[PDB]
């Protein structure tokens, strides 16, 4: 069963199955990918659409009518299959002139290039409908303290985001943007290493409501963070305008692995958390097939990424819906997690015996929690072993 | 040489020194210290002042008569010594009726119970000089996905803490809050998990001007984070009200070693940021002599933090005075990234063709960052070896 | 279902369930529980059996009095029960005598102390039946590179293994030792602090036979390492003679979670390892429930432990026999894994243009490995999806 | 000062300043370097001699002639400058053919061929004068638990590394092998992941003799471990036939910075092992160059590597003729740590009073070990602060 249909609004990146395999230590294990044979593929597996960087869909360097024929064939592909796309973003990372960075590069010609580079693609964005524009800054930062004063770096990548904001309120454009962290991998630290520090620096734009977080698992996992509770933050904030799904394990090398390889248990609380919140947003993967994969692997991974998250949405219902996990949930007080503290006010807390002089310490402290139990349901559900 | 006096403004909690080395596996290999012992040695050592949680300086449950006279000690102890207190904190971890939180406590009882002890010693804090107030939520948090809810968790957080600001400003107190990150230990994960996390939920609070960060050098490394740069990141925020010095090797428990040891090279970055900023706050130290150490070891741990301080405060000044590093600097075009990229604004911008249409981006590629050849004076000037 | 019983040869350590809740950070919060109570509740539960170390059965320092009526009300509670003791072992690591090690402390009356202590206890573990006792050495290793040369420390590990190889031989015993790897956590680094670094150590020893590794999941996950395939590797050296089961959220403090919980896939992989290559020692779980757990916790979490197992032991088998999964093995060639690469020989294999000359390098890189079909199985075996 | 001379026996892989900066988000940012120019450069720096794999030196499907003239080019350069060639390897991991394994593919044929591509190189390895032949089997692993089971990847790599055996002995060569662990990167899990699995898997081999381990800083750091230490228990195993050093920043993917760059006091304790133990085999750099630099910057980093070898070499000699160390050492009873525990016999250590009945335990625990005067002490002649 699980079959995912484009009402599931499930999304991939051209740069995902279109991945050649090259890696730090490796040449391609698979031919180029035509973006107009990726969307046919998507599209039969039951996907909702697709996103591009710049360069996945114009060659760099491409002559305009060049670029407009590569847009022409593309669009002809979405019309045939009825693909949306909900999201692009821009490339500031591939080509060596970036080797420093976009936004925060030590040369200020650079960072003037990658405004320009940015803001063309917006413009082809909002032609193809989308939505939100992802910005994934893996080139700033640094592999030496010298090399980057952060502080300055900051005051550079809020005149970027400032710049951007006031080219798309000028255009009239809809648009928002999501900014992406990473804590490391291609530079030795990448700044806005994670979403506390993405949303950190958003507050601090001129125009906060036009940016977003696009968190995603691997990044957060490669510090060791929890997945669930950063995007937890990101809603609690109203931030997660665009997120991107994949698999990871732990803190290695950023391993894209199809979303729900990597931590399994952490894929569940994720969506179980995404649709509890009633997320709206693409359900977005940023993945690679392994390089051991030919074509065939390429689209069972793709495949895979939607049936488990189907999989996991099941499993996180019914668990939810359980007489016995609601039971559970309260006997592990999560109701009185969601009842304000103190709505009686301060000077009542104050003037409230019950929570100091008389408050009975140890009987509280010898109140279980009852989490193992409450946790091996979860277990339960999340195997089919109910 | 390198030898401090209280002008450095060096401090210690009474609990880092008076820690008696019990671990997960292991009993007390020390004696507990009187404070007034503590005070009498750092004092003697060239520390500026100490610190405290409330059960550090009146054991828990202590009467008010036991509690004016262990407050009556320490004041005649800090008289005698001319040492100071700049910071105070509650402990809201180590009591069991504490296992699941203080403000994010599932139970109610439990946070309304943290709040009032937080708010007895914020009095007892201001008796006593201090200017800041750290916050260390070190049980907030959860080891399993259906324990903790934390939108609502971080609802009942942002409730507490606007309670404390309510109260600070109805006493007309001038002490601030410093929310101290840790992404994990002892809860499987802690809610604000790293200086990014604490900074976005700052900005939520009612009275955000009232609370900055605490950062810990280890706290953020146990995320396997760039500490200089997350402190860069506060300072940019106008947040680093109050700093932990200790040392850490990368991504493990909580070691706490003396400042110094740990991430070396880090030690050196981020002494050079801070006096680079101007940061005017205590350098306060949050470590742990090894239980290996009797207590002549405990001294000789709380001196070396201190000299180690004032070594790397001496090589990172050599390196900015140096012509050469100035030189390196400006080859590796660290004033370019103090420029604006486009104060010329984004209608200018846009019509620049050097910024696009003739934007020479292989020229651009070409030239190097001589990043090495700067972070090799680095290295030099860190180990004298120039 | 799923429900344990005596022949899964389920085993618990005294001091999991029986583990009051102190951590780095907080106080106890359970009471301690009586060995003969522990043993009652485990064997309600299903389980076959209990370790112990020496000081969890008999109080440090008690009289020969004492020892012998703790030992006559243990072995009353095994005889009531059925219960076994397969596996016993020495704490090395409680006492602050041990602060800088047993085997390899740098003093060396404390060395042979440790080796007495041991020697005692391995006569109690004979007389209780057990097979196999464990060595922890979790205070040997350093915070710091001078406080221990690691040749040196090597060779009194060496000498003090081989003195307790000497004793059993001696004695005629029959029992086993298995040394257990971490790799840091109470010292900052551990020596062995893997299995391949037990592994490795043992073949120096005077009478390797005697001598295996008891891996714990936990451990071998704070380095970041693949659990199944280390013991995989103990396994090809013939030397699994015990293992530890519980979850691990990769590279944190030692979190001693209930088996299961963690890192969920490994824990399928691991059984799916065990059952395969007929595993016949005991299934131990070296767990701690969380200090948030009152004692109706604790036995959820225990029953948990072999709950998992049992659902993950089903799952696992019903992959290796589905005809589908086993056509998926041999498309990606795992049939072709198993058979020898050169049979035939060195010459043959110099003489065969087939292997060189001849090789269609292209058409070999050509085909697919057909590994993401075959893990999307395993996924929908693992969650009951098929 | 500091300036290397060959005398100091410091070598360099081609592929290590002619890395042309490709990494998996990103084009190259160098020129592709003739090795006729690198052993010029290099030899001007004061290196020793170089290393190569075969394809850095032939590229991959060269003819005979083409093959012929590129090694007279190579033999020319080297007869030029007086440069060696101590240590080659084959690249059994760029090519796509090697998308699963070398030696543990799981096609067969490609098993075969990786051997007869490894032979041939050993061959030109000989002609060259190299007595060190290194095997890192970077492809050797896989990311999903049903693609590779590990007992039979450990039967198919001992075949491989059996036969090299058998045809080096065949040939009379007197070259060794020295495998290289690395735990991940390329693949998820790489097979003998750390330098303790690979000492462990060698006591396996039918010829253990003729083969040792190539550690390198990185790779043990990659798991969080203390490089060190495991070049200790290399040295104690005698299995130390080369080194690979550089500098990791902890849990990440493979940085191949500078050496002494990343982890500044590990880089301190390790020359202080290699130097104290008499390590007499090449210090060979694998590092990369940051892609930020030209080839100004490469050879700036390629000199830092031998600065930092050279400065550390001068503190850590420093310390340990320092007589204040010297006392400290005593101090901490280091010399106690490398006496033999019970020289006088099991007998004797069961019948001594002092070593259980009579041994006061409470005294022995009271003694502090001095580890952080005697670390400060490391510090301070590390910094040049005596
Ligand atoms: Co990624
Ligand atoms: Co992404
Ligand atoms: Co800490
Ligand atoms: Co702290
Ligand atoms: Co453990
Ligand atoms: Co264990
Ligand atoms: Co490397
Ligand atoms: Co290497």
Known sequence: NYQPTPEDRFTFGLWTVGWQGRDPFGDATRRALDPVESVRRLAELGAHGVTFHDDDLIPFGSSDSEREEHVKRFRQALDDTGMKVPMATTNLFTHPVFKDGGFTANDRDVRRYALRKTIRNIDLAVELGAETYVAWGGREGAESGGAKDVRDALDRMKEAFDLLGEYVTSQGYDIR?????????????????????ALAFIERLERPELYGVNPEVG??????????????????????????????????????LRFGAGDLRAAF???????????????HFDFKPPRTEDFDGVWASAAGCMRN??????????????????????????????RPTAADGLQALLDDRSAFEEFDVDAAAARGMAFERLDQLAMDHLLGAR
């Open 177 to 197: 943007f999501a900014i992406e962290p990473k804590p490391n991998e291609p530079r030795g630290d990448i700044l806005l290493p994670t979403v506390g520090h």
């Open 219 to 256: 990044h957060e996992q490669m510090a060791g963070l929890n997945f669930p509770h950063g995007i937890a933050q990101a809603l609690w904030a109203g931030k997660l305008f665009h997120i991107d799904l994949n698999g990871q394990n732990g803190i290695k090398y950023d391993q894209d």
């Open 269 to 283: 609380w994720l969506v179980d958390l995404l649709e509890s919140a009633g997320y709206s947003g693409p359900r």
């Open 309 to 338: 998250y189907l999989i996991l949405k099941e499993r996180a219902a019914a668990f939810r819906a359980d007489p016995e996990v609601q039971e559970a949930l309260r006997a592990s007080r999560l109701d009185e997690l969601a």
